Amino acid sequence: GMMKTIELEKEEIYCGNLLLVNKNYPLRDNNVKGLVPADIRFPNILMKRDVANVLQLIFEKISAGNSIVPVSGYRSLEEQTAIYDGSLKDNGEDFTRKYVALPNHSEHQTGLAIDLGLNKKDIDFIRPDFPYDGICDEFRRAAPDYGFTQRYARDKEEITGISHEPWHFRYVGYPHSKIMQENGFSLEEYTQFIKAYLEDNKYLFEQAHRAEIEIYYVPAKDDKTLIKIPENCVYQISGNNIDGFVVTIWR
Ligand SMILES: C[C@H](N)P(=O)(O)C[C@H](C)C(=O)O
Ligand SMILES: [Zn+2]
Secondary structure (H helix, E strand, C coil): CCEEEEEEEHHHHHCCCCCCCCCCCCCCCCCCCCEEEEECCEEEEEEEHHHHHHHHHHHHHCCCCCCEEEEECCCCHHHHHHHHHHHHHHHCHHHHHHHCCCCCCCHHHHCCEEEEEECCCCCCCCCCCCCCCHHHHHHHHHHHHCCEEECCCHHHHHHHCCCCCCCEEEECCCCHHHHHHHHCCCHHHHHHHHHHCCHHHCEEECCCCCCCEEEEEEECCCCEEEEEEECCCEEEEEECCCCEEEEEEEC
C-alpha cells in the first residue's frame, strides 16, 4: 500500500516511551505534558496519561484493590534535587549514589516511572516495601504484558548504575516490555539490542491470535531523519535518548 514519510528533527531523539535515562544519558527535554493523577485516591501522584491508564488496567487484572499504593510518580527537577540532597544528609553519599538518581538523570522526571508499595500505614518513601510474594509479585509478573518493566534488578547493578530496587517500574510500552522479559534485559541492554535490527532487517514480535508487530532502529542524522511508514498500519516512534529512533509497526 501507500507508504508515508516521517521527517524528524534530531532533538526528537530525546522524546518518547523508550528513552534511556541514566547516569550516562541525561533527560534533555523537561517539557513532559499530558500528566494526570494516576488515581483518584492519590491526586498528588502524577503520571503520563496513557501510563496511568495502563497502571489501572494492571490493577484491575490482578484485583489489587487497595493493597498496592503508588508512592512516587512524576517528579520535577526541584523534587529530585531535594530527594538527592536530603539523602546525602540522612543516608550518606554511598547510599545516595546507589539509590537516588542524579537530578536530570531520573526516570521519574519523564512521567514513565512509578514506585509502588504494599499498602501499610507507614511506608518508606525512598525504599518502599514491594516484595516478591503475594499481590506485589502478581503485579510484577503481569507488568510486562502491559508495557511495564522492573527497572533495577540485582543482576544488572553494574550496568544500570543503581542498586536492586524491588519497587521501581518503568513504562516502555508493549511489546518492548515483553521482549525485555523474554530475554532478561535491562533497558540498557534492550537499547543496544534493538540497534541490531535496522529497517532492512526488522525484529518480528508475534504471538497467537493478535497481529504481528515489527520493530526496528533508525539512526538519527545530524539534521532531519527520514522514516517511512505504511499508511496501512498503527505505528509508534520513540527516541532512545542517545542516537536514534525505535519504530514499532502493528501489522
Ligand atoms: C528514590 C527512590 N529510591 P527511586 O526513585 O526508585 C531511585 C531512582 C533511581 C530515581 O531516583 O529515579
Ligand atoms: Zn523510583
